[PDB]
Amino acid sequence: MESKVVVPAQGKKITLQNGKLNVPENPIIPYIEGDGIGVDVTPAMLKVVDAAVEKAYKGERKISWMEIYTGEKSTQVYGQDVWLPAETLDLIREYRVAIKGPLTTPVGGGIRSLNVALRQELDLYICLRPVRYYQGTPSPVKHPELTDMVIFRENSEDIYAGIEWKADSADAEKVIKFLREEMGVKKIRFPEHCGIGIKPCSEEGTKRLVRAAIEYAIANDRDSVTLVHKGNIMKFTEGAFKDWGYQLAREEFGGELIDGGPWLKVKNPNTGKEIVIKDVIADAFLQQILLRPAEYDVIACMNLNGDYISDALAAQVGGIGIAPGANIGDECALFEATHGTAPKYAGQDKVNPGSIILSAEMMLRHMGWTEAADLIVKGMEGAINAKTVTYDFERLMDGAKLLKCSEFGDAIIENM
Amino acid sequence: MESKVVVPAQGKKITLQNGKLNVPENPIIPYIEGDGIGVDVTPAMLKVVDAAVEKAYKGERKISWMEIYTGEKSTQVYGQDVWLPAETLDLIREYRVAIKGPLTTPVGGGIRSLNVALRQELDLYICLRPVRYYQGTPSPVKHPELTDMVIFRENSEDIYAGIEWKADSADAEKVIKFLREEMGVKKIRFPEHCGIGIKPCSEEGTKRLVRAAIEYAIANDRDSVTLVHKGNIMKFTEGAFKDWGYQLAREEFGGELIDGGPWLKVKNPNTGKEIVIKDVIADAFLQQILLRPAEYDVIACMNLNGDYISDALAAQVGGIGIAPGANIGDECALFEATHGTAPKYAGQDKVNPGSIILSAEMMLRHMGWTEAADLIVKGMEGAINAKTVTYDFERLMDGAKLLKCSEFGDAIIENM
């Protein structure tokens, strides 16, 4: 089969020169509709983004959307077993900036996460999850407004590497024999009927992630960067991530000891502000985000902890369904809805398009189209304050006006 | 050196016959004071427990406390480098039931967690963390009273096995060569300057833990058992834990499919109640405990996830410093304060003795001395409701009367 992707006639490709995106006034942006509710949320995002772009630049700029495929729809387009076509990886890399709805992975075929596959195959090593509170959002906590954090989750290593062998398989036995006989491992409690997973953490992987977090703190004049890890138990992976993170702050950003340690102060070269570089053990950190959220800002952590932290924070601010996210690498970036596919409601024009819309806000900002991005934030803040919202919010409040998915997109536009 | 432990003259050893403890009226109970604030909280616990015992059984029963050592104090007693004496492991096993204050592990000597060492060496495979709300406790969430859960955290395997090699070490390189050359591993993003950790999960380890969780749900007529795991990424360890947990429910407890699955219903043989056996992915679970806490009850999970879940739950109910905990095995059990050593306040009679006191409540209950246990719960509930509390609580409320650590122990007794 030939490609089924149609490159927009009007429209120009974004280019990269010196780690800086050169964005034309008519950029072609690939988008993946997404499985399940992607069918509801993606069109709402397309309309909201076009309106923000149109309103901000008065018609001088316009995105040429180009549909590309991954997931169930990809099998419908490309046939049986084509869940993630090579052309999709090629196109995201070529066009530099893309966005996607939610995706789920089939079970029973030995296929691993399609979301993780996109991240790893494109080497999008930064999973960026900013978490703030939108006034008027129903929240399970007393002071959600105190939460304003940005999570830099390492996206290329950790136990997500997907290196593991099934209990009783010849391979697991082979690995366990090697560990026990050649490495002298004596700590496996039950070596029989035992599954084995491998957790890698490297200096290069850690430093490119932490480097991005510190550059982000500098560029946005944030107050601190917290390295979250479980290094007191996993000394050589989690503990190494922490050590390498502080080392990078010292070696590349002039970080110097605060008092007697272990925190460092990094001077913002643009504002002269002192950015604090500190660290917190992961289990205590899940308590601290609830008890002292105001003391945290930019967070840098490994893949698994980042997954947990991002989710816990989204829930606490009432944003489980409106949490934006990006996967960024040195050559391209893929923005994404961060919730699941919710098939029970798919096609009903019911769910909250807020997450994919705020991920589109991050995309526009990444493109340097900050005015259009600010209009989306403004629209989202006003629609939620107006209490004109989708069921997931409405059901938790009194005095709200219930809107369909598409209608909430319109409300966002109405509030720009 | 000879033992420095003094076996109580009056006092008899608890015995085990058929997996059932035979507790005399004068049981000898070993206790470890603990590092840091253990010096403040342990004496408060001893006094509170003695009072509950005295009040419940009118003098017919009395614990003969026997001090044993681990941590900084152990080095003071047994000399340089004796952080965890063999005799301590021997004594906890011999006397069957013991309690300890907090312990921290020295850094710089390549020593691994002393708390984990106690758990693994004594094969205390169940880390039991019940989490409920005490009326009047200052909490960061709007409805902490909806939380009433019991966590069964697997304590003998997972990445806590402590099997890992340092970046650039000959061993790490050896392991990575084996993986890449012999196992054909291609998923390690950066094989150089790479730390490696091993995560084991076995059928026997999983099932003894889940078996205990289900027996606990039956014995206490709880509503459900939720298997929490991250099996969609770690198929052979986390996913296997989930699969084995449902399998055990079917094989040993008659669990049968609910509707179209995947949940099972297990009939309580004593009350005829239908216990639901279900599962939730770990990242979503950290959101669900905040958004729908009332839907969860008994939780069964692996070592790392349990560590995180226990901490997150304790924080949400305002119980970061009063969370009880037990480590239970087939031959003995070790109850423990669950917070850290807080050396900055050690010796000031300032901190909350609530966690070690509620762990003593679990110990008394475990001993079958449920009346004395109920008196501690009653005392704790009344002292907190009276707003007569330690600084960690007082500072978060208005109208409280500030009490010292020792004074709060007295307030607990005053409210029995």
PDB file of C-alpha atoms in Angstrom, chain A residues 182-286:
ATOM      1  CA  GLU A 182      27.680 -15.487  37.331  1.00  0.00           C
ATOM      2  CA  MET A 183      26.830 -12.328  39.304  1.00  0.00           C
ATOM      3  CA  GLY A 184      26.552 -14.140  42.600  1.00  0.00           C
ATOM      4  CA  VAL A 185      23.094 -12.708  43.240  1.00  0.00           C
ATOM      5  CA  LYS A 186      21.554 -14.032  46.422  1.00  0.00           C
ATOM      6  CA  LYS A 187      18.728 -11.562  46.904  1.00  0.00           C
ATOM      7  CA  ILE A 188      16.023 -13.107  44.724  1.00  0.00           C
ATOM      8  CA  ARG A 189      13.571 -14.438  47.374  1.00  0.00           C
ATOM      9  CA  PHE A 190      11.864 -16.930  45.063  1.00  0.00           C
ATOM     10  CA  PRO A 191      13.978 -17.741  41.980  1.00  0.00           C
ATOM     11  CA  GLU A 192      11.346 -20.151  40.597  1.00  0.00           C
ATOM     12  CA  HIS A 193       8.246 -18.995  38.692  1.00  0.00           C
ATOM     13  CA  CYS A 194       9.818 -15.588  38.787  1.00  0.00           C
ATOM     14  CA  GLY A 195       9.361 -12.745  36.318  1.00  0.00           C
ATOM     15  CA  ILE A 196      12.392 -10.436  35.832  1.00  0.00           C
ATOM     16  CA  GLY A 197      12.503  -6.776  34.747  1.00  0.00           C
ATOM     17  CA  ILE A 198      15.561  -4.584  34.014  1.00  0.00           C
ATOM     18  CA  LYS A 199      15.777  -0.906  35.102  1.00  0.00           C
ATOM     19  CA  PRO A 200      18.453   1.158  33.272  1.00  0.00           C
ATOM     20  CA  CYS A 201      19.491   4.738  34.264  1.00  0.00           C
ATOM     21  CA  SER A 202      22.374   6.462  32.470  1.00  0.00           C
ATOM     22  CA  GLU A 203      24.448   9.591  32.835  1.00  0.00           C
ATOM     23  CA  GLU A 204      23.589  10.846  29.358  1.00  0.00           C
ATOM     24  CA  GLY A 205      19.879  10.093  29.709  1.00  0.00           C
ATOM     25  CA  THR A 206      19.723  11.749  33.088  1.00  0.00           C
ATOM     26  CA  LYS A 207      21.663  14.823  32.085  1.00  0.00           C
ATOM     27  CA  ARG A 208      19.806  15.681  28.888  1.00  0.00           C
ATOM     28  CA  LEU A 209      16.575  15.563  30.895  1.00  0.00           C
ATOM     29  CA  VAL A 210      17.845  17.636  33.849  1.00  0.00           C
ATOM     30  CA  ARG A 211      19.547  20.086  31.431  1.00  0.00           C
ATOM     31  CA  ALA A 212      16.169  20.709  29.773  1.00  0.00           C
ATOM     32  CA  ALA A 213      14.507  21.210  33.201  1.00  0.00           C
ATOM     33  CA  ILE A 214      17.107  23.794  34.319  1.00  0.00           C
ATOM     34  CA  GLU A 215      17.017  25.626  30.955  1.00  0.00           C
ATOM     35  CA  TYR A 216      13.233  25.742  31.377  1.00  0.00           C
ATOM     36  CA  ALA A 217      13.499  27.171  34.886  1.00  0.00           C
ATOM     37  CA  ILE A 218      15.885  29.855  33.525  1.00  0.00           C
ATOM     38  CA  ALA A 219      13.781  30.670  30.469  1.00  0.00           C
ATOM     39  CA  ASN A 220      10.616  31.010  32.517  1.00  0.00           C
ATOM     40  CA  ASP A 221      12.179  32.455  35.658  1.00  0.00           C
ATOM     41  CA  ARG A 222      10.938  29.638  37.898  1.00  0.00           C
ATOM     42  CA  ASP A 223      12.064  29.430  41.523  1.00  0.00           C
ATOM     43  CA  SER A 224      13.479  25.927  41.856  1.00  0.00           C
ATOM     44  CA  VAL A 225      14.190  22.570  40.316  1.00  0.00           C
ATOM     45  CA  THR A 226      13.494  19.514  42.513  1.00  0.00           C
ATOM     46  CA  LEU A 227      15.108  16.181  41.633  1.00  0.00           C
ATOM     47  CA  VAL A 228      12.600  13.519  42.823  1.00  0.00           C
ATOM     48  CA  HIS A 229      13.955   9.994  43.183  1.00  0.00           C
ATOM     49  CA  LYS A 230      13.877   6.874  45.407  1.00  0.00           C
ATOM     50  CA  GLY A 231      17.660   6.785  45.753  1.00  0.00           C
ATOM     51  CA  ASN A 232      17.808   5.471  49.280  1.00  0.00           C
ATOM     52  CA  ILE A 233      16.698   2.020  48.033  1.00  0.00           C
ATOM     53  CA  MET A 234      17.802   2.165  44.341  1.00  0.00           C
ATOM     54  CA  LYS A 235      21.249   3.659  44.749  1.00  0.00           C
ATOM     55  CA  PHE A 236      22.551   3.057  41.245  1.00  0.00           C
ATOM     56  CA  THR A 237      19.607   4.135  39.161  1.00  0.00           C
ATOM     57  CA  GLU A 238      17.416   6.536  41.154  1.00  0.00           C
ATOM     58  CA  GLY A 239      20.287   7.663  43.428  1.00  0.00           C
ATOM     59  CA  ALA A 240      22.534   8.075  40.352  1.00  0.00           C
ATOM     60  CA  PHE A 241      19.847  10.200  38.629  1.00  0.00           C
ATOM     61  CA  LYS A 242      19.873  12.527  41.668  1.00  0.00           C
ATOM     62  CA  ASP A 243      23.696  12.650  41.840  1.00  0.00           C
ATOM     63  CA  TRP A 244      24.040  13.289  38.114  1.00  0.00           C
ATOM     64  CA  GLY A 245      21.352  15.945  38.254  1.00  0.00           C
ATOM     65  CA  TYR A 246      23.169  17.954  40.948  1.00  0.00           C
ATOM     66  CA  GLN A 247      26.459  17.374  39.119  1.00  0.00           C
ATOM     67  CA  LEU A 248      25.010  18.786  35.906  1.00  0.00           C
ATOM     68  CA  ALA A 249      23.736  21.849  37.793  1.00  0.00           C
ATOM     69  CA  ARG A 250      27.291  22.438  39.130  1.00  0.00           C
ATOM     70  CA  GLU A 251      29.178  21.660  35.876  1.00  0.00           C
ATOM     71  CA  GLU A 252      26.978  23.482  33.416  1.00  0.00           C
ATOM     72  CA  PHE A 253      25.023  26.080  35.323  1.00  0.00           C
ATOM     73  CA  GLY A 254      27.394  27.202  38.063  1.00  0.00           C
ATOM     74  CA  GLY A 255      25.390  25.732  40.871  1.00  0.00           C
ATOM     75  CA  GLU A 256      26.967  26.189  44.268  1.00  0.00           C
ATOM     76  CA  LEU A 257      26.311  24.818  47.687  1.00  0.00           C
ATOM     77  CA  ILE A 258      23.598  26.433  49.812  1.00  0.00           C
ATOM     78  CA  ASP A 259      24.607  26.507  53.481  1.00  0.00           C
ATOM     79  CA  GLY A 260      25.840  23.041  54.327  1.00  0.00           C
ATOM     80  CA  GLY A 261      24.103  21.277  51.458  1.00  0.00           C
ATOM     81  CA  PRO A 262      22.713  19.355  49.753  1.00  0.00           C
ATOM     82  CA  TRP A 263      20.867  22.118  47.898  1.00  0.00           C
ATOM     83  CA  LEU A 264      22.505  24.304  45.258  1.00  0.00           C
ATOM     84  CA  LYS A 265      21.730  27.786  44.041  1.00  0.00           C
ATOM     85  CA  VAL A 266      21.895  28.451  40.275  1.00  0.00           C
ATOM     86  CA  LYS A 267      21.856  32.081  39.212  1.00  0.00           C
ATOM     87  CA  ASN A 268      19.399  32.971  36.478  1.00  0.00           C
ATOM     88  CA  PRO A 269      21.684  34.571  33.832  1.00  0.00           C
ATOM     89  CA  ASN A 270      18.800  36.639  32.591  1.00  0.00           C
ATOM     90  CA  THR A 271      17.115  37.843  35.732  1.00  0.00           C
ATOM     91  CA  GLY A 272      19.840  37.360  38.303  1.00  0.00           C
ATOM     92  CA  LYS A 273      17.332  35.318  40.330  1.00  0.00           C
ATOM     93  CA  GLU A 274      18.747  32.461  42.425  1.00  0.00           C
ATOM     94  CA  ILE A 275      17.168  29.186  41.321  1.00  0.00           C
ATOM     95  CA  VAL A 276      17.251  26.518  44.081  1.00  0.00           C
ATOM     96  CA  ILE A 277      18.228  22.989  42.965  1.00  0.00           C
ATOM     97  CA  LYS A 278      17.064  20.492  45.621  1.00  0.00           C
ATOM     98  CA  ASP A 279      15.848  16.893  45.916  1.00  0.00           C
ATOM     99  CA  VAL A 280      13.084  14.960  47.677  1.00  0.00           C
ATOM    100  CA  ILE A 281      12.594  11.170  48.058  1.00  0.00           C
ATOM    101  CA  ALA A 282       9.653  10.053  45.882  1.00  0.00           C
ATOM    102  CA  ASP A 283       7.382   8.668  48.616  1.00  0.00           C
ATOM    103  CA  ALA A 284       7.793  11.801  50.751  1.00  0.00           C
ATOM    104  CA  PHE A 285       7.285  13.905  47.606  1.00  0.00           C
ATOM    105  CA  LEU A 286       3.794  12.413  47.055  1.00  0.00           C
TER     106      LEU A 286
END
